[PDB]
Structures are given as C-alpha cells and as structure tokens.
Amino acid sequence: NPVDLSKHPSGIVPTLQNIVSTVNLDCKLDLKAIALQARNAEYNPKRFAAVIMRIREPKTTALIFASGKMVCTGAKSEDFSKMAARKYARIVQKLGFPAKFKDFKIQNIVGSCDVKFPIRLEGLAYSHAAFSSYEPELFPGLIYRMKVPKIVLLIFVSGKIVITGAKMRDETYKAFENIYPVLSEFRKIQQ
DNA sequence: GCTATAAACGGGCA
DNA sequence: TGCCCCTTTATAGC
C-alpha cells in the first residue's frame, strides 16, 4: 500500500494478471476416467492430449496429462497459482490416483499497467528499431523485446502496457521501470 | 473471430 | 534442435 520506491521509482506498480505454473503429480493418470468422473473436466485427445479442468476459486484452468505433469494457468498471484495447483492435485487424489506434488515451479508471469498518458508509438519504434516491432496494420500494439531482463512488452497508444515472460515478479517490475523513462519521451496529448 | 506476446504440457511435422 | 499447435491473460484494431 506504500509503494516501495526502490523497486518502483516510477511510483507505478504493474498488476499481475496471469501466472503459469507446473507441477509433477508423479503418477500415471487415466485421463478418460478423470474426464468422465470430474464435473468440470473436458478431454478431446484428437485435439489436445490433456484433460482440461477448471475451478472457481482461485479461478484457474489446469492441463492434466497422462504422464502426471500438470500446467496451472489463470491465477492472479504466485500464491494463488500454487494454491490452485494443490486443489487440482487433491481432486485427482479423490478419484483414487495416488498423486503427489513434486517440483512446483512458476513458469511465466504476465502483468499489465497504465502509464496514464498516450504514446506516439511510431517514435519509439524509430528510435528503438532493434528491439521494437510495430506493424499497425497487423496488430495495433508495439512489441518490445527487452534484453535485460529478458522480457516482452506490448505497448499501446493508450498508455496501457502488457509485460510478459518473467519467472519472478521483480523481473516484471524491472522491465517496466526500464521502459517507463523511454515511454515518457514519446508522451503525446490525450484528446 | 482474426491479428500480437510469454511459458509449460504432449504431440503433429522437419 | 527447429517449425506448427495446445490454455491463460492483459492489451486493441478490423
């Protein structure tokens, strides 16, 4: 609630919007059995090899594979992603699979924020051509590939920003603080 | 729906 | 190894 200015000298804190984590349930799973018995689980192996299962709290989607690997998507924080993963693991256990909870790992963190002024994207693409891809007839946002940390930002004329590719939220924050002074150089008036 | 980004998974191609 | 999918999420123009 007090913004730590040593991590956010802009004074702006990106909001986390999506976490991807993995965990190894460490046993073989009968996906047809799981899809039949579990209420909110779909399975079309012709299309995709996973059982797709969804829970309401934390609101998430798991991809559960016959190998015992699981991907958990959609949570708003690292803690919520781990808590959701444990709930999916318990669902599988309650069906009689002896599932464990091995090597849980946060794999991707997506954040977004709003610098609250419009941005002349053409100018940023021009001066940062090596890191920028801006093709407004293909997609209206500028794609910025930051090297340190290795992070991708989507930058929009509105001042909204998407920040993805982090394994640690401090990478999300560092990328935003690296880009904020650059964005400010291309601020334009809002009609 | 399409177009754009990252990551994991199993799985098609080379 | 790479390519192409696969779900999720913010963003936003056709």
CSV table of C-alpha atoms (C1' of nucleotides) in Angstrom, one decimal, chain B:
chain,number,residue,atom,x,y,z
B,1,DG,C1',-13.5,-14.5,-34.8
B,2,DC,C1',-8.8,-12.8,-36.7
B,3,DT,C1',-4.2,-10.3,-35.8
B,4,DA,C1',0.3,-10.0,-31.2
B,5,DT,C1',3.4,-11.8,-26.6
B,6,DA,C1',5.5,-15.3,-22.9
B,7,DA,C1',5.5,-20.0,-20.7
B,8,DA,C1',4.6,-25.0,-19.6
B,9,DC,C1',2.5,-29.7,-21.4
B,10,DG,C1',2.0,-33.8,-25.2
B,11,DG,C1',2.2,-34.2,-29.9
B,12,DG,C1',1.9,-33.4,-35.4
B,13,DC,C1',5.9,-32.0,-39.0
B,14,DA,C1',11.2,-31.5,-40.4
